[PDB]
């Protein structure tokens, strides 16, 4: 792909992020926490699952980033409206707010309704994400397959500002321990 001229730099909005997260002192890392990190309660943090979002608010034009995943058993990556549901249980799909693809138990999947098998061959450590707000797409990229196309979400429907959204997942295997990064331009 041509679309690494669009970088942004992404940083994470720790209001927003579950109570055992631990994001880095620049917001470019997180990682999931062995408990509570001790910090107070309120309506924008996600509660019942390990996520988090991105600072910026995205309501126009072309934006690209990326985000190391290496070695994780389990993650979610995207973008997402800035309205979606914070509290209780709900899935990862456009209805709900979110363009996402994911890793769990060794395979890739996008977060449609129901979800779409994923092909890939080069299991990735880099992921690049591609959003097109005026076209409706959000696109995928293998960075450890020389870009090679993962996913593309056509006439999406966005319906609001779009925020970057991240899941480190759960580390119930003792497997998945390792943050995901936002990667340097
Ligand atoms: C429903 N399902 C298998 C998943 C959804 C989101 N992330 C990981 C897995």
Known sequence: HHHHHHMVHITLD???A???????????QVRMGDTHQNVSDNKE????????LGAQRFSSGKMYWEVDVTQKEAWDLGVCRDSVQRKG???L???????????????????????????????????????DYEAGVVSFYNI??????????????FAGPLRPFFNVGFNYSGGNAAPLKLCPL
């Open 14 to 16: 720790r209001n927003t």
């Open 18 to 28: 579950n109570s055992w997260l631990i994001i880095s002192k620049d917001r470019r």
């Open 45 to 52: 943090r996600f509660s019942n699952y390990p996520m988090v």
């Open 89 to 91: 249980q709900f899935s």
């Open 93 to 131: 799909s456009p209805e709900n707010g979110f363009w996402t693809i994911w890793l769990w138990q060794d395979s890739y999947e996008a977060g449609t309704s129901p979800q779409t098998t994923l092909h890939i061959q080069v299991p990735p450590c880099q992921i690049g994400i591609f959003v």
């Open 144 to 157: 450890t397959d020389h870009g090679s196309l993962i996913y593309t979400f056509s006439e999406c429907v």
